[PDB]
């Protein structure tokens, strides 16, 4: 819907258009794989795990 | 993403970074501060929950206190702590990416009042004055009638 | 080679800069047989992004800050769409080709050393556009300079705006809002929407279509306490009923058709309407806030000067405002939100005795049952009251024999001294429809009572005047009223005034006032009266040369 309709509309400001462009540049499988195990390793933060 | 840290509980309500907004559609209003694009901090207890609840429910792990985050000193301490935590998250690259994604993942807007996102209507405005050829009513400006109609 | 001092400078070279090789990259239109072609654009997104060319010392942040501090803030103005359009009609024999290209504002951060520019950084801010047209024939050869531009050029007049880097108001005590005029623009082209160069035979137009409704008002207060931003907005809404400050849905558009012999250059600016919220007290302003409400633009039409006559390096003017619109000044009194407004719910018939219920000055709102002259004396005339007329009341909700509170806070002062020790009473003509406020000053233990009384004849001659009861007859000083206003003094002979510039002396018979004299010029008068050993002297001010008026009364 964004790629065919919103992206191309010249009567919508960039504040929403560009933010929606970056919102859908991320695949839904990336959000499912985003857990605390990634930030704990990227921050060196020790937390309960089991 | 730069977390705006020049904020305080005594900051004047400029309607640009410090606002007073209605809690959903109840009678309660609360003060919120903008620390990042599309990210706000409200240094007070949540409106929806009842600060005083019957002892019958009182879930386990139940530190309960109705006098927390009441004075403005505690509210300012909470706001500063949240700003510090957001800066800590934003320091590295994973946290910066997460915060940028949060700030750019706006909920999908609804279409125009008639449905659809394709294109709005057109308005012809600003007819030129008459001349030797005269009737310049069609020589004018074209405008998208609902702009940002979503 | 410059004629300045050593150091860094911020220079604006003006608007109307066309980049090199970027001439036909947007496209052109071909029209024929008398048809009219209109090409336009909307500076909103992806064409309002400035082009930076930074030198090692002057980075992007330095350039942006040192340019937006002195000159127009393009970052804020880039979010509001601005439309421009060019229209041209082809001859009804030939064909016409016409193409559009963006123009830019050029800013230079320079570093002058020993009268020599040794380093430069250049910012190009997207301004409006420019259309070049030519009437051609099939097979005609057109000079290559028409299509292709080799070096950046300034189609408009050159400029080098540089900057080094390091009377008597006869009002009454209360709040006033002064509409000071419309068409205010900030200095140094800080509010310039942009410039269009219309060639001969063409037409240009610049439009703000309110696609984004946001507007940027300007505020400047002498005291953040009391006169705040929200306080000034509230007083503006009370005075002129202004409802929208940062929002507007009023489109505007300027269209100029150049003649067939020369070119025209039209510059569009954003304008403001100036409001002054003074706090006039005892003849001098004690607090003043200036509010500039976004108005609907200004269009300046000019012709190009002589070709490269003289480019003069001129310094920027000091930060300020210039009024291009007509000279205006409208003063409207405002109810002080400080005071409480008591209401008399019943229309005063022929006589009323309002019993005053804290000790702070306040307002009493009332209306009369019949248009007539009323005396509004107080208990022994100890508190000197003031009276105001609510502007615009009586043309709306109406109930016979009752007060319909039209919640109007824009009051017009009628009469009444601000002195809390002078003994006086008012005599005012009150209309049945209109609503009136009575300001009671700081009161004390005496209950006091405000007495309204229908005055038919006798005292019906001192209309719209305050009469002070002088019981010590020597001189007396009072707040001088404006020109063509009235004051009165009642006393139990030389009579004149010190500073100010008619007069009439009446004898009271307990009242049944009888005139004894008229047309008495009290301005430094030396005549005598020799009255019989109670008379009322009525004075009309013809020239307010001082805030106060002194009643010189010598036996």
The string of DSSP letters for A1-50 reads -IIIIITT-TTS-HHHHHHHHHHHTS-HHHHHT--HHHHHHHHT------
CB atoms within 10 A of CB B25: 5
Contacts of B98 in chain A (CB under 8 A): 34, 39
Give A11→chain C minimum CA distance, Å: 9
Helix (H) or strand (E) holding C274: strand C272-281
Distance CA C368, CA C346 (A): 9
Method: cryo-EM
Residue of C nearest to B129 (CA): C255
Distance CA C300, CA C309 (A): 21
Task: For residue C503, list its beta bridge partners.
Answer: C539
| Residues 6 or more apart whose Cβ sits within 8 Å of residue B36 | B1, B2, B3, B4, B86, B99, B103
Residue of A nearest to B143 (CA): A11
Alpha carbon C66 to its chain centroid, in Å, reads 30
> Mapping DSSP to helix (H, G, I), strand (E, B) and coil, where does residue B90 land?
helix
Q: Are A11 and B148 in contact (CB under 8 A)?
A: yes
CB atoms within 10 A of CB C310: 7
CA torsion, ordered C348, C352, C353, C354, to nearest 10 deg? 0
Q: How buried is residue C285: exposed, middle or buried, by Cβ count under 10 Å (0-12/13-18/19+)?
A: middle
Residues of B with CB under 8 A from a CB of C: 125-126, 128-129, 131, 133, 139, 141-144, 147-148
Q: What angle is formed at CA C302 by the lines to CA C21 and CA C200, rounded to 5 degrees? A: 60
Contacts of C44 in chain A (CB under 8 A): 13
Distance CA C65, CA C70 (A): 9
DSSP code of C189?
T
Question: Beta strand C410-415 with C321-323: parallel, antiparallel or unpaired?
Answer: unpaired
Residue of B nearest to A5 (CA): B118
Give C255→chain B minimum CA distance, Å: 7
Beta carbons of A13 and C46 less than 8 Å apart: no
Beta carbons of A9 and B95 less than 8 Å apart: no
Contacts of A3 in chain B (CB under 8 A): none
Closest CA to C375 of C412, C401, C348: C348
Closest CA to B129 of C302, C296, C300, C253: C253
Take residue C310 and report the two structure tokens written for it: 């003289």
Q: Are C381 and C375 in contact (CB under 8 A)?
A: no
CB atoms within 10 A of CB C183: 20
Nearest to A26 among B101, B109, B147 (CB): B101
Take residue C164 and report the two structure tokens written for it: 């080094």
Beta carbons of B117 and A6 less than 8 Å apart: yes
Helix (H) or strand (E) holding C37: strand C36-43
Locate tokens 């052109």: which residue? Answer: C28
Q: How buried is residue C551: exposed, middle or buried, by Cβ count under 10 Å (0-12/13-18/19+)?
A: buried
Distance CA B90, CA C132 (A): 50
The dihedral sign for the CA sequence B103, B108, B112, B116? positive
Distance CA B93, CA A32 (A): 19
The dihedral sign for the CA sequence A14, A19, A24, A26? positive
In whole angstroms, how far apart are CA B71 and each of B44, B47, C414? 9, 16, 49
Closest CA to C129 of C197, C80, C189: C197
Q: Are C503 and C537 in contact (CB under 8 A)?
A: yes
Closest CA to C19 of C100, C124, C120: C124
Take residue C109 and report the two structure tokens written for it: 């951060």
Distance CA C242, CA C478 (A): 35
Task: For residue C388, list its beta bridge partners.
Answer: C413, C437
Per-residue burial over B132-148, b if 16 or more Cβ lie within 10 Å, else e, is eeeebeebbbebbeebb
Give B26→chain A minimum CA distance, Å: 28
Contacts of B109 in chain A (CB under 8 A): 16
In whole angstroms, how far apart are CA C535 and each of B82, C38, C455, C511? 78, 80, 18, 10
Please, after which residues is chain B broken with C–N above 2.5 Å?
A: none
List subunits contacting chain A, requiring 3 or more Cβ pairs under 8 Å: B, C
In whole angstroms, how far apart are CA C11 and each of C61, C120, C154, C192? 16, 10, 15, 16
End-to-end CA separation in angstroms for chain A: 41
Interface test with A, best of C45, C80, C212 (most A CBs within 10 A): C45
Closest CA to C209 of C163, C241, C171, C250: C250
Locate tokens 């018939």: which residue? Answer: C349
Residues of C with CB under 8 A from a CB of A: 44-46, 79, 212
Distance CA C446, CA C426 (A): 21
Contacts of A14 in chain C (CB under 8 A): 45-46
Distance CA B148, CA C79 (A): 13
What backbone phi and psi angles, to 5 degrees, belong to C241?
60, 40
Nearest to C255 among B128, B142, B143 (CB): B128
Question: Beta strand C153-154 with C117-136: parallel, antiparallel or unpaired?
Answer: unpaired
> Mapping DSSP to helix (H, G, I), strand (E, B) and coil, where does residue C44 land?
coil
Closest CA to B33 of B44, B25, B24, B49: B44
Q: Kindly provide the resolution of this structure in angstroms, with one decimal.
A: 2.8
């Amino acid at each position: 819907i964004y790629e065919t309709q919103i992206e191309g509309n010249n009567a919508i400001g960039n504040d929403i258009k560009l933010r929606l462009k970056q919102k859908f540049r991320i695949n839904i499988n990336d959000i499912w794989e985003l857990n605390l195990n990634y930030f704990s390793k990227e921050f060196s933060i020790m937390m309960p795990d089991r | 993403m730069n977390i705006n840290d020049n904020l305080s509980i005594n900051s004047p309500v400029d309607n640009k970074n410090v606002v007073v907004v209605r809690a959903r559609k109840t009678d309660t209003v609360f003060k919120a501060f903008k620390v990042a694009p599309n990210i706000w901090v409200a240094p007070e207890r949540y409106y929806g929950e009842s600060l005083s609840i019957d002892e019958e429910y009182k879930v386990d792990g139940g530190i309960y206190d109705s006098n927390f985050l009441s004075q403005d000193s505690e509210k300012d301490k909470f706001l500063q702590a949240i700003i510090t935590l957001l800066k800590r998250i934003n320091s590295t690259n994973a946290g910066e990416k997460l915060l940028s994604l949060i700030s750019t993942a706006i909920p999908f807007p609804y279409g125009y009042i008639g449905g659809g996102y394709y294109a709005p209507n057109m308005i012809t405005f600003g007819s030129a004055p008459k001349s030797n050829k005269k009737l310049n009513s069609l020589i004018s400006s074209t405008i998208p009638f609902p702009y940002a109609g979503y | 080679t410059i004629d300045l001092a050593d150091g860094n400078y911020v220079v604006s070279r003006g608007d109307g800069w066309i980049l090199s090789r970027q001439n036909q990259i947007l496209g052109g239109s071909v029209i024929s047989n008398g048809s009219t072609g209109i090409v336009g654009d909307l500076r909103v997104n992806d064409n309002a992004i400035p082009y930076y060319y930074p030198t090692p010392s002057f980075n992007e942040e330095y350039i942006k800050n040192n340019i937006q501090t002195v000159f127009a803030n393009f970052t804020e103005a880039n979010q509001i769409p601005i439309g421009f359009e060019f229209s041209k009609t082809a001859p009804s024999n030939k064909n016409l080709y016409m193409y559009l290209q963006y123009t830019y504002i050029r800013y230079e951060i320079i570093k002058v050393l020993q009268h020599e520019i040794i380093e430069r950084a250049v910012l190009y801010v997207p301004s409006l556009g420019y259309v070049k047209s030519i009437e051609f024939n099939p097979g005609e050869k057109i000079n290559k300079d028409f299509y292709f531009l080799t070096n950046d050029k300034c189609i408009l007049n050159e400029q080098f705006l540089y900057k080094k880097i390091l009377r008597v108001l006869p009002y009454s005590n209360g709040l006033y809002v002064i509409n000071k005029g419309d068409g205010y623009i900030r200095t140094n082209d800080k509010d310039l929407i942009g410039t269009l160069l219309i060639e001969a035979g063409s037409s240009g137009s610049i439009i703000q279509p309110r696609l984004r409704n946001t507007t940027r008002p300007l505020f400047t207060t002498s005291n953040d306490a009391k006169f705040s931003q929200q306080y000034t907005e509230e007083r503006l809404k009370d005075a002129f009923n202004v409802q929208l400050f940062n929002t507007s849905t009023s489109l505007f558009k300027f269209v100029e058709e150049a003649p067939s012999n020369k070119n025209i250059c039209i510059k569009a600016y954003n304008t403001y309407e100036k409001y002054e919220l003074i706090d006039y007290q005892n003849g001098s302003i004690v607090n003043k806030a200036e509010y500039y409400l976004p108005s609907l633009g200004y269009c300046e039409v000019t012709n190009a000067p002589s070709p490269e006559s003289e480019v003069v390096k001129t310094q920027v003017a000091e930060d300020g405002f210039i009024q291009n619109g007509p000279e205006e000044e409208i003063v409207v009194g405002v109810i002080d939100p400080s005071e409480n407004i008591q209401e008399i719910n019943t229309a005063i018939s022929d006589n009323y005795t309002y019993n005053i219920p804290n000790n702070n000055p306040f307002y009493i709102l009332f209306t009369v049952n019949t248009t007539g002259i009323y005396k509004i004396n107080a208990q022994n005339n100890l508190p000197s009251l003031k009276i105001y007329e609510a502007i615009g009341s009586g043309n709306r909700n109406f109930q016979s024999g009752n007060l319909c509170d039209d919640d109007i806070k824009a009051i017009n002062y009628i009469t009444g001294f601000d002195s809390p020790n002078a003994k006086s009473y008012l005599v005012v003509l009150l209309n049945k429809d209109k609503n009136y406020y009575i300001r009671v000053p700081q009161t004390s233990n005496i209950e006091n009572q405000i007495k309204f009384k229908r005055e038919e004849g006798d005292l019906r001659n001192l209309m719209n005047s305050s009469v002070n009861i002088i019981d010590n007859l020597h001189y007396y000083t009072r707040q001088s009223p404006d020109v063509h206003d009235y004051i009165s003094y009642e006393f139990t002979i030389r009579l004149y005034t010190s500073y100010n510039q008619i007069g009439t002396l009446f004898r009271v018979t307990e009242y049944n006032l009888i005139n004894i004299q008229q047309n008495l010029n009290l301005l430094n008068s030396t005549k005598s009266i020799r009255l019989l050993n109670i008379y009322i002297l009525k004075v009309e001010v013809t020239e307010l040369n001082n805030y106060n008026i002194k009643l010189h009364i010598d036996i």
